[PDB]
Amino acid sequence: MEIDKELAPQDRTVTVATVLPTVPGPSPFTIKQPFQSEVLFAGTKDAEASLTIANIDSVSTLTTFYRHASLESLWVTIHPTLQAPAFPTTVGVCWVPAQSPVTPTQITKTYGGQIFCIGGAIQTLSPLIVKCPLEMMQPRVKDSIQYLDSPKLLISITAQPTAPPASTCIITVSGTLSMHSPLITDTST
Amino acid sequence: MEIDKELAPQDRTVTVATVLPTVPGPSPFTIKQPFQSEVLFAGTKDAEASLTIANIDSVSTLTTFYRHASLESLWVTIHPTLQAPAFPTTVGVCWVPAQSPVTPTQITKTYGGQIFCIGGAIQTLSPLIVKCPLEMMQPRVKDSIQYLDSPKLLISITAQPTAPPASTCIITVSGTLSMHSPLITDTST
Amino acid sequence: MEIDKELAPQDRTVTVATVLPTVPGPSPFTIKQPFQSEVLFAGTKDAEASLTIANIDSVSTLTTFYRHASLESLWVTIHPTLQAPAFPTTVGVCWVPAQSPVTPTQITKTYGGQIFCIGGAIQTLSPLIVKCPLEMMQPRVKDSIQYLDSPKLLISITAQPTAPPASTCIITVSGTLSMHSPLITDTST
Amino acid sequence: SPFTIKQPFQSEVLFAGTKDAEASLTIANIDSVSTLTTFYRHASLESLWVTIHPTLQAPAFPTTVGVCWVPAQSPVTPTQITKTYGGQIFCIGGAIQTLSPLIVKCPLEMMQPRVKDSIQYLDSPKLLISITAQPTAPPASTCIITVSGTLSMHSPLITDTST
Amino acid sequence: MEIDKELAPQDRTVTVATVLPTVPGPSPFTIKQPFQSEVLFAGTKDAEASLTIANIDSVSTLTTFYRHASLESLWVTIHPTLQAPAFPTTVGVCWVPAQSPVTPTQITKTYGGQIFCIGGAIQTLSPLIVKCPLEMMQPRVKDSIQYLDSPKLLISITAQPTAPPASTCIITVSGTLSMHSPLITDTST
Amino acid sequence: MEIDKELAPQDRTVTVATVLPTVPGPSPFTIKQPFQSEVLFAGTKDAEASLTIANIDSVSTLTTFYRHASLESLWVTIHPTLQAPAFPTTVGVCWVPAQSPVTPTQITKTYGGQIFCIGGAIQTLSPLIVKCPLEMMQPRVKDSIQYLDSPKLLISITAQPTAPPASTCIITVSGTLSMHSPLITDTST
Amino acid sequence: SPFTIKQPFQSEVLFAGTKDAEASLTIANIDSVSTLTTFYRHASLESLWVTIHPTLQAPAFPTTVGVCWVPAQSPVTPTQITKTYGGQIFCIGGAIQTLSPLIVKCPLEMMQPRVKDSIQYLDSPKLLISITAQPTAPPASTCIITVSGTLSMHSPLITDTST
Amino acid sequence: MEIDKELAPQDRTVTVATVLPTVPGPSPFTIKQPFQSEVLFAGTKDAEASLTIANIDSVSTLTTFYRHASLESLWVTIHPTLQAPAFPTTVGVCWVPAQSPVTPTQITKTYGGQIFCIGGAIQTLSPLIVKCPLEMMQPRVKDSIQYLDSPKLLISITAQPTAPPASTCIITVSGTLSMHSPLITDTST
Known part of the structure; x- marks a missing residue:
């Protein structure tokens, strides 16, 4: 039956990035953490937004304890x-x-x-x-x-x-x- | 699952165009390039627009350095x-x-x-x-x-x-x- | 996904026509030509129309050069x-x-x-x-x-x-x- | 191999006699030709x-x-x-x-x-x-x-067939 | 031993053109004709020249009798x-x-x-x-x-x-x- | 046969640079592009010039629409x-x-x-x-x-x-x- | 596998005692380090x-x-x-x-x-x-x-070796 | 083709030196380092020079961190x-x-x-x-x-x-x- 979630996938094409591999040996312990971040309350007035994901309340927050995060x-x-x-x-x-x-x-x-x-x-x-x-x-x-x-x-x-x-x-x-691989920092609060 | 982007294809029939075959020799490396070009912001008034996609603000620029492109x-x-x-x-x-x-x-x-x-x-x-x-x-x-x-x-x-x-x-x-096939010209801008 | 073309096929039954076969021998060269003909701009006032297809701008036009046309x-x-x-x-x-x-x-x-x-x-x-x-x-x-x-x-x-x-x-x-089989006429214009 | 037709024609190109005259005629552009070809992409x-x-x-x-x-x-x-x-x-x-x-x-x-x-x-x-x-x-x-x-x-040119 | 003809080949790369094939069947009779065309008497003063080969005294001349010439x-x-x-x-x-x-x-x-x-x-x-x-x-x-x-x-x-x-x-x-395939013209002079 | 373009290679030794490996996935189509950039018109006076080829009038432009290029x-x-x-x-x-x-x-x-x-x-x-x-x-x-x-x-x-x-x-x-790998951006100029 | 060497060092970073003081030091940039590394492309x-x-x-x-x-x-x-x-x-x-x-x-x-x-x-x-x-x-x-x-x-950085 | 580097090898004969072998066991890690040292700006006036290689800006410099260097x-x-x-x-x-x-x-x-x-x-x-x-x-x-x-x-x-x-x-x-085998010294500067 119907599902109240409709979607519009983005038209796409083959283009890719490059990354570095952490030194060989013991695979480090990793965790996965999900999230939903309020990014905009539209409707009231015209407006635009350019959002470098890597630094959004939710992400920033989460990652602030690891050296590597994908x-x-x-x-x-x-x-x-x-x-x-x-x-x-x-x-x-x-x-x-x-x-x-x-x-x-x-x-x-x-x-x-x-x-x-x-x-x-x-x-x-x-x-x-x-x-x-x-x-x-x-x-x-x-x-x-x-x-x-x-x-x-x-x-x-x-x-x-x-x-x-x-x-x-x-x-x-x-x-x-x-x-993975934690960042030493003010664990305090 | 629902999908927003709705479409309605055009009625069609067979009619082919004759193109030029590459001269005998080495097959040149080729790359693809996507795009989306603003065609018109309508609704405010009756208006018409006919244009040869071939040469438009976009495409013309992406091909600026190649000899062939379809x-x-x-x-x-x-x-x-x-x-x-x-x-x-x-x-x-x-x-x-x-x-x-x-x-x-x-x-x-x-x-x-x-x-x-x-x-x-x-x-x-x-x-x-x-x-x-x-x-x-x-x-x-x-x-x-x-x-x-x-x-x-x-x-x-x-x-x-x-x-x-x-x-x-x-x-x-x-x-x-x-x-494919690079158009030999001047590079500076 | 959805297609912006909805249809209502006509209720039907078995009834058929009869036709004559062009003399045996060499099959004549034939072409196929498609079309769309503006037949009515309704809405403004009530109106009716009885259209003998064979003679409508588009068809008439097309066929005016052949003896046989199906x-x-x-x-x-x-x-x-x-x-x-x-x-x-x-x-x-x-x-x-x-x-x-x-x-x-x-x-x-x-x-x-x-x-x-x-x-x-x-x-x-x-x-x-x-x-x-x-x-x-x-x-x-x-x-x-x-x-x-x-x-x-x-x-x-x-x-x-x-x-x-x-x-x-x-x-x-x-x-x-x-x-097929062309009609001799004023090819002029 | 697309389906083709052959179409014949006679085109009036000049009424001579009255005065001396020259004429250079690119065939593919004469009323007759222009016409038949109207609906195709290839004509020979x-x-x-x-x-x-x-x-x-x-x-x-x-x-x-x-x-x-x-x-x-x-x-x-x-x-x-x-x-x-x-x-x-x-x-x-x-x-x-x-x-x-x-x-x-x-x-x-x-x-x-x-x-x-x-x-x-x-x-x-x-x-x-x-x-x-x-x-x-x-x-x-x-x-x-x-x-x-x-x-x-051969090969139909998609246009306004109406007339 | 030495040869009084020294040369500087042009730096190059893979880029190619497209051409049309004369209708199948009987290969047409072709001739080959060579030439040397005086294109410039340099030294006296600075000067530049953009020469579309196809139309240079020698070539123009030669080809003026054929429909196709490579x-x-x-x-x-x-x-x-x-x-x-x-x-x-x-x-x-x-x-x-x-x-x-x-x-x-x-x-x-x-x-x-x-x-x-x-x-x-x-x-x-x-x-x-x-x-x-x-x-x-x-x-x-x-x-x-x-x-x-x-x-x-x-x-x-x-x-x-x-x-x-x-x-x-x-x-x-x-x-x-x-x-090959000759061009009808004023053969005169 | 003599050749004009004379050359003198540089003394060398082994020293490698570490580069980033493409992330796992589909190998993108790639094309080559030549060039020649004016470096300097010397002779008139003592002068020096040091420049990172990486970013120069030329190259920068040829790569303007791709994510990777060596x-x-x-x-x-x-x-x-x-x-x-x-x-x-x-x-x-x-x-x-x-x-x-x-x-x-x-x-x-x-x-x-x-x-x-x-x-x-x-x-x-x-x-x-x-x-x-x-x-x-x-x-x-x-x-x-x-x-x-x-x-x-x-x-x-x-x-x-x-x-x-x-x-x-x-x-x-x-x-x-x-x-290779197209850089998704605006096309108009 | 390029040929490598190991080089040790001690770097004076601070003379304390006289007054209170803070210090944030990115190691790779200290006189000592900067120096040895001078001639290589990779140092760890x-x-x-x-x-x-x-x-x-x-x-x-x-x-x-x-x-x-x-x-x-x-x-x-x-x-x-x-x-x-x-x-x-x-x-x-x-x-x-x-x-x-x-x-x-x-x-x-x-x-x-x-x-x-x-x-x-x-x-x-x-x-x-x-x-x-x-x-x-x-x-x-x-x-x-x-x-x-x-x-x-490892891997030599080509520069002015003179001094 | 020609190479802008011409050479005059020295006339020679069989004569050789003697050296000591570092104690057996683990081969020490060694590096190779190349160089070019400005040793003389001749032409202006007659002059002579006796250069004990081992101690020339470039070499001296390089070696100042190793006990053995060949x-x-x-x-x-x-x-x-x-x-x-x-x-x-x-x-x-x-x-x-x-x-x-x-x-x-x-x-x-x-x-x-x-x-x-x-x-x-x-x-x-x-x-x-x-x-x-x-x-x-x-x-x-x-x-x-x-x-x-x-x-x-x-x-x-x-x-x-x-x-x-x-x-x-x-x-x-x-x-x-x-x-190889490093010399302890003022690593400072």
Whole structure:
């Protein structure tokens, strides 16, 4: 039967990153930790956002204890609020490697980028999902070095002229991390 | 599981274009390159647009340093905006060979021609896609000579009499092409 | 996934035509040519139409150069315009052999005939298709003789009392022809 | 192997006699041709020639008329018909000038017969014409000049079929 | 033993053109014709030259009787004059496909391009040869169509400030052609 | 047979650079691209030039749309001008890793360093070439991270006290590089 | 497998005692290290630690000195030595404070030992130091702080060997 | 083809040194380090030089960290400057074991010793190389002891009476060392 989660995968193509292998020998103990991060409360006014994933409350937080930390799955969901029905909202999004020179305004000039009309009594409010294609990027968000093609998220919001009382929909980004080899630091609090 | 990006292919029939075969010798290395080019922000007013995909802001630049390049895939995507629901819009679409004398005004008198009503009713806000039938077109976009049957897109727009405050939808052309054989020239910019 | 082309096949039964075979020997060279013909801009006011296919701009045109010309596929599409949402429209249609005494008003008293409610914010604007059952007719639209059971199209339009600014939907008829043995004539223009 | 058809034609190209005149004609662009080819992506000439039909004006007003088949990008001018191979010149009047077997076959064996393809060719057939009329000119055209042949076209060109 | 012909082959890489095959069946009779064309009398003053090979006295001339004509070998020789010893001269050259946007001034910014110091009592006056790599180009200089990557020659001359009485060296381009299927024309003279 | 382009390779020894291995997955299509970049017009006055080939007017542009690209081949070419004979010039050359603190002033205190006298005597006007030993360098020029041992060229120029009216020679860097993995960005220019 | 050498060292990093002081030290950048590595493309630490040598000033002027090994990009400040793992604080005076086995092994097992490679690493060893001196301060440095270890370098860096 | 490095090997004969073997057991880790040392800027005035290799900026420097250090290859290059053409210079050289009583003035009375005329518009400026025959000497430049037959270099310069503005040619000595077992010392700076 129906599932209240509808999705729009990103158009894609073969492009890949490079990474370094921790010295041979004993495989280090690793953990996997998942998450959902509130990244935007759209609808109220137009706005844009360029988000270098590696440093977002949720991720930053999690990883602050490991030298190496990789991404195992990543995606963004667009949860429509109760204002959506009365207030259609244009939302554009695109996954891109950190160092891609793109601005949210250029989502449409960029390959994968797409835009949606969220809201209106005639559209469906099924939460939207754009699984990020890490195949296309650099999954490591923390390593002994600084990769520059980690995932970057672009989001563009075009709100109603006669704007709504509050945020018309929420954008969160969820995923799962695989970290290891701990970072010494203020364990305190 | 539901998928947002909805599509409606074009009626078709067999018609082949004659292309030039590579001269005998070594097969050159080849690479693919995707893209998405802004085609038009319609909805505000009646308007038409016919263009030879072959030479456009994008493609022309990606091929700037190669002698040959054809299209592996190509399609048009109509992205409904927050205005589509409140302002239903008529959109004409049709793929034709460059040298086809057809004008947007005749999209309906043409075989493949298709017309769609954006927004205003149930299931009308999903991004619409009309893949180009390269199968019956001239794929080669850059070669040792110019063809005249390369992909040409025709778009027709019929806006509401009581027009909307902004574009009700955005039409973009996405696709990926292969290229090879370096064009020996000057490099500096 | 979804396809923006919905269809209503015509209720049918076993009834067939008769045709003459071009003299034995060398099979003549034949071509196939497809088309879409604007046949009606409904919605504005009630109206009816009895269309002897064989002579419609598109077909007439095409065939004017061959002694024999047959139909390989035929159907009618009802493309809803941007006025459809605000203006429901009743549209009835029926495929029938040329010499069937029926008038569009009697679509309902005739077997296959059907009627649709096009428009309204609650209905879907997917273009409607009634593939014509040539199995039931005489497919030859041009021969050494005059068959009288070639396809005839019946269409009835019941428009809103408080009528809409313009045509609420377009009806086109597309198909493909198989002609041969040329007709000598003013090739000029 | 796509399905093809052959279509024949006769195109009025010139009404001579009244005054002297030159003419360079890229065949693939004549009303007739342009027309049939309208709906296809590929058209080729299976055969072609020019023919001269003489009017009743002729006997009274003999006319010098020369013609020549040539490949589109040949530098020739009607002035030099007789200096080139296909070159031929005829009179038109009070002599064996009325029999209609007055035609000149074009030798496509010597040029590009393709007249519509995915590209532009420069050696399609071109037809030269040089007319030299009577000083004391005739009242009406002294003869008609047509070009006929047959076309082999395939692969449909998608356009507005309506008309 | 020594041979008074010294050469500087052009640095190269894999890039190729495309061509059309004359209709199958009887192979047409073809001839090969060689030549040497005086293209420049350098030394006297600085000067540059962009030479679309296909149309140079020698070639033009030869080919004016055939529908199709291809190149079998091509190269440029720089014959030093008797003024060379007393008057060193800078000469730059580069082979390039017709439609490469390069100017002689940019020979150095272009891959293959090279420059030589011709003259001076201390250099050798062995004639210089830069065999052109047709492998890299479009060898057909005359066909049923207009290729745009036929060979183009770029030459730059930097002459002595206190210039010499006359041309310090001659540049000729020699090669061999393979034509067929004759062009009807004024055979006269 | 004689060949003009004369060359003198650099003294060498083994020293490897550590590069990043492509993450597991599909091998992306790759293409090569040659080039020649103007390095300096010397002879008029004493001058030095040290530059990281990695990022230069040329290369930077050819790679603008790819994520990875290394150097298949690289070398320096000294092209004597018509002034070289009359004005002998000293030229210092040496290939070193980007992070090598060596300055042109120390080309001679460095292992590979080489010095040449241009013109003035017998056999001194032939274009001189010093291939770069990528074998003992960091080839990768564009990757998921920046290296600091990439090719770096050092040039030293010592002109005649009674200087020449113009550059006695031109130093250029030629080579070809391979690239793959498309960098997803905006296309318009 | 390139040929490698191991080279040891002791680097004076700080003369404490005179006044309170903080210190964050990215090891790979200390005079000693910088030096040996000068001629190679790759250097790694096979072992490393900090040691505190006490001066004769010490008995008279006890000093609070803490230290901590940490990975280059750890957000810690000497102020928080004791809040982190490797953290350790010592006194320096009229107690078991003169024995020189006053060293703290750095656990490279917990960080990146590479100190020069074809790239820049951000987790190489960093050493924190927090000194708290006597209000009525001593005349001279109260103790010396050095860092010693051994380097494993390979692959020659081509430069001006002259000096 | 030609290589801008010409050489004059030293006339030689069978004579050899003696060395001590580090105690049996575990072979110590060793490194090899190459170099080029500026040893003389000749041309300006006559001058001589007796160079006990073991202690020359480059070597001294390198070895200052090992107990044992041997030579694997050694030679001297004579790089002609831009003054060479106008200013011929006599240069004599000879390889000799440290304790050989010879002075540069006696190069000619000594077996291997040779002299060259560097410069003049009629001679070639190819850099000269006299690979040193360590076979003939004591290759160890640093050991647990003091060998006295390590390589010594003798050089004699006879400059033009009407001397040149600056150094007419450079003499450098390059080689490669194999050291091991480190020397404890001020690692500082």
